[PDB]
Design a protein around this ligand. Structure first.
Ligand SMILES: OC[C@H]1O[C@@](CO)(O[C@H]2O[C@H](CO)[C@@H](O)[C@H](O)[C@H]2O)[C@@H](O)[C@@H]1O
Ligand SMILES: OC[C@H]1O[C@@](CO)(O[C@H]2O[C@H](CO)[C@@H](O)[C@H](O)[C@H]2O)[C@@H](O)[C@@H]1O
Ligand SMILES: [Ca+2]
Ligand SMILES: [Ca+2]
Ligand SMILES: [Mg+2]
Ligand SMILES: [Mg+2]
Ligand SMILES: [Mg+2]
Ligand SMILES: [Mg+2]
Lengths: 569, 565
């Protein structure tokens, strides 16, 4: 008979959906998505088979970086709604069985925060809240003010801004208006516990931890009392105001940042012990090399950090230039490097990167969602991947991403702009794809909404959405929660992923990631006994769900993906 | 289990002839030298040897600059010595491969002299191109393109006699054949046929990424500039200044290799006996490297391209997860049916124990022998030879002479990995009766020599013998593999095969002690017996491992023999 299995803790195999609240659902016609919008479509997550939602920032913000510049970490941004709307969202989401995670932005605060206003004024308790530094002594040319170091902002220009009021530079690794906290300040670290405790006390199930690689910079005590220059990249194409001019040796991935993360986890473990109910969790966001990335989980010496760091490998290391061997070899990187008992996770997109079908190909949407849902651990979905949304066209004139406005111009803005991945969600074929009742939206609705929208995918017989639902349904099967995984390339074109578990059904992904047809021998696929049944097929496959596979020779079209259901091992 | 063709699980040993054995006290290794020590391969459990170049050569690049592709270099001996070498090697059961250098000929070859003098049917044997006019001094002729030699400076050298530039991707004295000339491609089959007729069991194919460069026909009759790297540490004469877009890894090169395999398959069909093979040498990204095996349109190339990952991607800086991740690369990218191979060193790179650590020699030789497929050994790895010190004054490597100076030569020189083989503690470590060796003998030959290792109870060489012997087992020739990191410090590699003994490598690649749970290792039941251990291990061959908790010291490697799955 099929063996009994114990249910995993929710966070070990959740489908996690990232909401970009500004682009999800406008409830009031201002062209701006809001909490009442999210509340009205919470049923969408149940329908989709999502377990957990994480929202991009909803806290009081001047919106310079659309929420990542927070002026009050304890209240809701007025365009999105009120604290009461937030409490209603949690209550309704929890009533539906969903978990809700918030975007925690610990690195930096708005220059409109009381933190920064108090700090610029050298108020007791706040004077050393941020990184304040003197001009670099300029004995040659003493009438010329030099910044503390050559450090470059992620958004272009110096990371140092002169304060006329304080007569000192402050550090901003992001926008001039995003001021870096001093994470060597015990008062700063205590304020971070206070912010997390507040939202946990409201009933948040956890947090996405933003931009952790930038937390800590070089102590001038270690550099003869100056901020040390970052080494030069030596790349001819970058001048001193351009991101790439430096290698961030003193400004990114400092070992001390991880001690802050392990302190957060210690705080969270204590909170969970003292509140019970379902485990509250932290997922860390940082782009770094595999070694620095795995230190977020914990270290050799027994430190425990984030429940997991996000795996951005499907954003940074795979694309439409990748073959089946590339896919397998990148999937193996997380599984080879992850610490013993670490929980794997998979991310195909977010609000900072081109949409999944734009980075890959429109014909690859189903295969990519299948990989996400069938790999062991946690599937992460970015708003619109469940319906195969493409980047929207955004003109220079409609561009509002500070990164593009700062680093770019009319000819180069598209190199930097994150706006094409933030265009409003495609609910239906109504005005503005049902995002808003208005033709005025904060970013232009993508031109293809008549072809790519949720309502159409629910009506039509075969759709990206229906495939999404069938895969999130399959994750409730013991073979996907508890089963072994085997992954290998059959050719440069096609790989398999097999989930198997004695006495339970076997499930096999076959994915042709290439631009050409491929014929493979299913005899090489471990645990695949024929005949087998198509469980899911890409929307243009020759095979419909229910199709029986009887021959060992299988021809796949470019982009074609199948999930087969086979008799138990 | 069906017996494999010899090349599919051979131990292949690269001999550097100039540094192997001097039989005639001139400080220069020779064929009589190799003949005198053929029994060493049988003693070591080597199946096949491949020799670096032994053909007539001005020695500017110590034999990769060939003046006559059809006769032996006088310092190494005669055609008669070579025929005796094949004879005695075949008598001892050994296969013998030759270093084939198709990319280029010595400027002192008849091919070049004839080509340069424009002799009919040789005009287009090499790449000849016109100068460009000069912006900033009209009198100073500019080369056809910005292309950079692998040995530094322009890849274009002006011929006073021909009034044209010729292409050299290597030394000025190494002249790149035109592989779009069907007479050049015929001459290659003529050379391979000659040596195969002599009884060679195949070839190592030199420098294949550089075979073909952009046709000026495709660029409005000019040689297109390679793109600039835009790295400020490289000036216009230094390797790195360019990205070799038009000078390396051109898709056309692979068609030449598939033509060579077609020719060799025909040769093997018409002559029978044991399969004659080609193994290709090319440093390239993994995807371009896999095209040497063949392509998905059904082309068949080299029996294998060399896997250089333990040279290029792993070092003393690597942890156990890096070891596993890099070993997975070949096995993930290799075409179905392909034979995996593992290279730890060669005459172009720092020796295995210098690139890693002296306390990792046994573990690295275990990896080589226990992974599926072909173990490749470079002269000296069987006794753990370290790089020898070679002063600027003693440096003879044209790469170091051309790219380097007294302060920098050590960044470029391949001479430290070419110092004479350490046979014993006699004069010049038994390489020569002469104290004058073409390169200085490493200072540590009294501590590291084959005679010392044959007579001590535990040694690198005795470990090497124990591992080559293990490869006879079905578990290694035909078994599955499982590889995973237990920590940042320790990994395992398990070979298993139903009803045959299980063999487990545990390797601490770190500088610190590590305790691992052996219950995490698949297919491993305890008690298990130590088959091989690092010479510094507390555990001896025969020792029983009984606890599931195992402390491995820095660099410690155990091979366990455990019950069959
Ligand atoms: O291009 C965005 C830049 O910042 C990162 C850092 O991890 O993204 C996060 O943090 C920024 C500042 O708070 C936000 O602008 C961004 O939206 C957020 O996810 C990376 O994506 C990248 O390096
Ligand atoms: O540093 C040597 C340089 O050339 C390579 C090319 O594969 O090595 C082979 O070809 C050279 C020219 O014939 C020889 O000098 C060398 O000995 C030979 O093995 C690489 O090692 C490297 O790119
Ligand atoms: Ca910071
Ligand atoms: Ca060439
Ligand atoms: Mg609104
Ligand atoms: Mg970007
Ligand atoms: Mg001699
Ligand atoms: Mg070199």
């Amino acid at each position: 008979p099929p063996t009994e299995v114990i249910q995993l803790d929710w966070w070990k195999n959740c489908v996690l959906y990232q909401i970009y609240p500004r682009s999800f659902k406008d409830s009031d016609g201002d062209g701006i998505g809001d909490l009442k919008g999210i509340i009205s479509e919470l049923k969408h997550f149940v329908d989709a088979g999502v377990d957990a939602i994480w929202m991009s920032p909803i806290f009081e913000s001047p919106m310079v970086d659309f929420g990542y510049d927070i002026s009050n970490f304890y209240d809701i941004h007025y365009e999105y709604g009120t604290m009461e709307d937030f409490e209603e969202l949690l209550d309704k989401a929890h009533e539906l069985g969903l978990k809700v995670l918030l975007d925690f932005v610990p690195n930096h605060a708005s220059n409109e925060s009381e933190y920064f206003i108090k700090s610029e004024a050298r108020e007791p308790g706040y004077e050393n809240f941020f990184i304040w530094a003197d001009p670099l002594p300029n004995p040659e040319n003493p009438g010329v003010r030099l910044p503390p170091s050559n450090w470059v902002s992620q958004f272009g220009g110096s990371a140092w801004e002169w304060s006329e009021k304080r007569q000192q530079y402050y550090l901003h690794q992001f926008a001039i208006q995003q001021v870096d906290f001093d994470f060597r300040n015990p008062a700063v670290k205590q304020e971070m516990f206070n912010i997390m405790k507040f939202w946990l006390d409201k009933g948040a199930d956890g947090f996405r931890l933003n931009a952790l690689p930038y937390l800590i910079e070089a102590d001038p005590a270690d550099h003869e009392g100056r901020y040390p220059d970052d080494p030069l990249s030596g790349l001819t194409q970058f001048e001193s105001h351009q991101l790439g001019y430096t290698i961030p040796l003193y400004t990114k991935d400092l070992i001390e940042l991880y001690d802050v993360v392990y302190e957060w986890r210690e705080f969270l473990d204590e909170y969970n012990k003292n509140h019970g109910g379902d485990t509250r969790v932290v997922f860390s966001e940082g782009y770094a090399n595999v070694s620095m990335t795995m230190l977020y989980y914990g270290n050799e010496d027994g430190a425990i950090g984030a429940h997991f760091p996000f795996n951005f490998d499907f954003i940074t290391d795979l694309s439409s230039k990748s073959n089946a061997r590339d896919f397998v070899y990148i999937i193996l990187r997380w599984l080879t490097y992850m610490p013993y008992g670490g929980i794997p996770n998979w991310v195909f997109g977010n609000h900072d990167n081109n949409r999944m079908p734009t980075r890959f190909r429109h014909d690859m949407v189903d295969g990519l969602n299948i990989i996400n849902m069938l790999l062991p651990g946690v599937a992460v979905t970015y708003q619109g991947e469940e319906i195969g949304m493409r980047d929207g066209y955004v003109s220079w004139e409609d561009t509002v991403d500070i990164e593009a406005c700062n680093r770019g111009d009319p000819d180069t803005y598209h190199l930097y702009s994150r706006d094409p991945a933030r265009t409003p969600y495609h609910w239906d074929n109504s005005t503005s794809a049902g995002f808003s009742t208005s033709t005025n939206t904060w970013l232009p609705v993508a031109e293809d909404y008549q072809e790519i929208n949720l309502a159409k995918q629910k009506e039509t017989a075969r759709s990206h959405f229906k495939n999404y639902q069938a895969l999130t349904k399959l994750r409730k099967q013991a073979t996907l929660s508890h089963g072994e995984y085997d992954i290998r390339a059959l050719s440069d074109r096609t790989f398999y992923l097999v989930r198997s578990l004695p006495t339970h059904d076997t499930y096999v992904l076959l994915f042709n990631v290439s631009e050409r047809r491929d014929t493979v021998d299913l005899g090489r696929v471990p645990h695949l006994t024929l005949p087998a049944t198509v469980y899911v097929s890409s929307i243009h496959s020759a095979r419909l769900a229910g199709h029986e596979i009887t021959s060992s020779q299988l021809s796949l079209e470019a982009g074609e993906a199948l999930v087969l259901k086979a008799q138990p091992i």
